[PDB]
Ligand binder design. Structure first.
Ligand SMILES: [Cl-]
Ligand code: NA
Length: 384
């Protein structure tokens, strides 16, 4: 791999700064956020980078008032290299006091940026009986229109500058009778053959036809997770790499738009039951797929980026621990992640971090780190 011979490069800094940090990220309206969680990042066809997160208003919890926030690079060419390269915090959607989340973007050929999102009402939570800031007790998410998880789509036609009011696609793209649902979170993909594939709970969402004017359909999957990732491997096949229901290992299945085989644990990819991210890097020799998760059966604080050279991504290398290039002052790094290629031949990664000031409790501030590193940096890691 010629990349190992390049000068290794890394830089990293907080991109979404929680309420407890100096210069916390707030909207121009003055609306602030206790925590930022659930990152998603894409590079547009112009080279601009768009970073999305859930703005969790009052606590770090997944229910209650949560808005979908974002930042863009100020120009199409700066590659988000330094803090001053990034615009201030903006909002995709924040209507009501319910939950707008699970950002799952994909960039189409015409530069339409699609962003699939999950939604639930202000008074509902996955488990039910959770206490809201005002003392209200939530109802459990159920199969009713009011109480179920919805699937929404918004898009941008101006390189992420503005977003449409999200359109509810639940009846079209979520099976009837479902209560809980999730899309991504992280990213969808565009195949060599032209289709879009967006990973979701128990299914893929497939986009066909004209870029930025797609016809959507559902590909049901057997044994898929709630939080899935998708990549097209060097062989042109599809690859689902999903969060397991119980701690242990990533669950992997391979297939095509005609169907997938069975999901099975990948023993080379330990996972503590957490979201992960995957990225198609290049198809020419040597072809590479990149993977990022917490490489541990128990902890989210073992973030590891890896490379596979396999046509079907059978095996990933040890890779490199992100702690080799640690960030100070932004809490304990580790959790959900998202990766993009940059325009200057780097990998850009968003990674959750937890101050843990309230332990596992709701008041522990959560921030999001932005990393840039090249293949050389990964390959020159001391553990492989
Ligand atoms: Cl198509
Ligand atoms: Na809101």
């Amino acid at each position: 791999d010629p990349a190992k011979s390049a000068a290794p490069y890394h830089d990293e800094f907080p991109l979404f700064r929680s309420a407890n940090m100096a210069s916390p990220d707030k909207l121009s309206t003055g609306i602030g956020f206790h925590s930022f969680r659930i990152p998603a990042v894409v590079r547009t066809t112009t080279g601009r980078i768009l970073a999305f997160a859930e703005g969790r208003r009052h606590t770090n919890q997944a229910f209650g008032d949560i808005n979908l926030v974002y930042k863009r690079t100020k120009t199409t060419a700066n590659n988000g290299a330094s803090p001053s390269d990034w615009e201030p915090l903006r909002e995709v959607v924040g209507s009501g006091a319910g939950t707008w989340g699970n950002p799952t973007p994909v960039v189409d050929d015409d530069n339409t940026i699609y962003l699939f999102l999950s939604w639930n009402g202000a008074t509902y939570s996955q488990n039910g009986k959770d206490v809201l800031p005002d003392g209200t007790v939530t109802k459990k998410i159920d199969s009713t229109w009011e109480g179920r998880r919805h699937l929404y789509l918004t898009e941008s036609r101006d390189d992420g500058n503005t977003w449409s009011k999200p359109v509810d696609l639940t009846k079209e793209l979520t099976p009837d009778g479902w209560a809980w649902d999730a899309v991504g979170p992280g990213n969808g993909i565009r195949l060599t053959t032209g289709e879009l594939v967006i990973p979701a709970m128990g299914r893929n969402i497939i986009g066909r036809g004209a870029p930025g004017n797609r016809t959507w359909s559902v590909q049901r999957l057997s044994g898929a997770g709630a939080e899935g990732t998708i990549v097209q491997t060097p062989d042109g096949k599809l690859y689902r790499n999903d969060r397991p229901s119980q701690k242990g290992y990533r669950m992997v299945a391979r297939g095509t738009l005609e169907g997938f085989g069975a999901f099975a644990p990948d023993a080379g990819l330990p996972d503590p039951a957490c979201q992960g991210s995957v990225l198609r890097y290049n198809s020419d020799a040597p072809a590479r797929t990149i993977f990022l998760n917490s490489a541990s059966g128990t902890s989210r604080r073992a973030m590891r980026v890896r490379i596979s050279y396999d046509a079907d991504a059978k095996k990933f290398n040890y890779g490199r621990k992100l702690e080799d290039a640690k960030v100070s002052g932004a809490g304990h790094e580790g959790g959900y992640s998202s990766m993009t290629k940059t325009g200057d031949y780097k990998i850009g990664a968003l990674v959750e971090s937890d101050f843990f000031n309230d332990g596992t409790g709701k008041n522990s501030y959560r921030a999001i780190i932005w990393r840039r590193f090249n293949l050389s940096w990964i390959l020159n890691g001391p553990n492989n």
